[model samples]
Target: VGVKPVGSDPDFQPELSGAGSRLAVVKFTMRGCGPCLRIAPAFSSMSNKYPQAVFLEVDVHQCQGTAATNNISATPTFQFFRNKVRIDQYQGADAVGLEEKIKQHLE
Candidate 1:
């Protein structure tokens, strides 16, 4: 499967936890976000590239609570989590760096 759309903290928090998904990459985005829109395709491709990990898209505009829970302060911010703990973060749409970070973490 591709990126999972998360609606709320209560709904998706569980996905961040548990041994089933030890590695999860979550992207915090907003409506009409130009950078995020551009990076969307790359993110989608990541789902295919690293099918072993979980990918999630959390729309900050729709899920403000989740945004707050994750301390989202900007659009197109990506958080890399390991078993529910945030270990790394990406704040912009750098396609090259995005994949590099993923590979580093996955390695």
Candidate 2:
């Protein structure tokens, strides 16, 4: 599977919890967000590039409870995790930077 969609509040936690000791990239996004849409293809490509990692996408509007719990205040916020703990987070749509970050963590 490439980018798994976290479609509900209940589905979010288990995925986050299960991503132990492996790199997990979760993109919190909202509908009609230009930047979020722009980065979609790059994010999917990264998922294909990094099969060892878990890639997830969450629509903030659809999963409001989960988004609220993660303190997602922006349209395109990315939360990076390893060992089931969040390591870093960033907002906006920097696909190059995101790939670099993924490479850094993998190394």
Could you say which candidate leads in TM-score?
2
- Residue range 9-75, candidate 1, lDDT tens digits: 6777777874264578998999878998999999999989888889999998778888887799998
The digit string of per-residue lDDT tens for model 2 on 1-107 reads: 89999988888779988877789999998888899999999999999999999999999988989889888999788899887788888788998888898888888
Give the backbone clash total of model 1.
Answer: 0
Cα RMSD for candidates in order: 1.4, 1.1
Cα displacement (Å) at residue 41, model 1 = 0.5
Clashing pairs in 2: 21-83
- Candidate 1: list runs displaced more than 4 Å: 18-21
TM-score of each: 0.92, 0.93
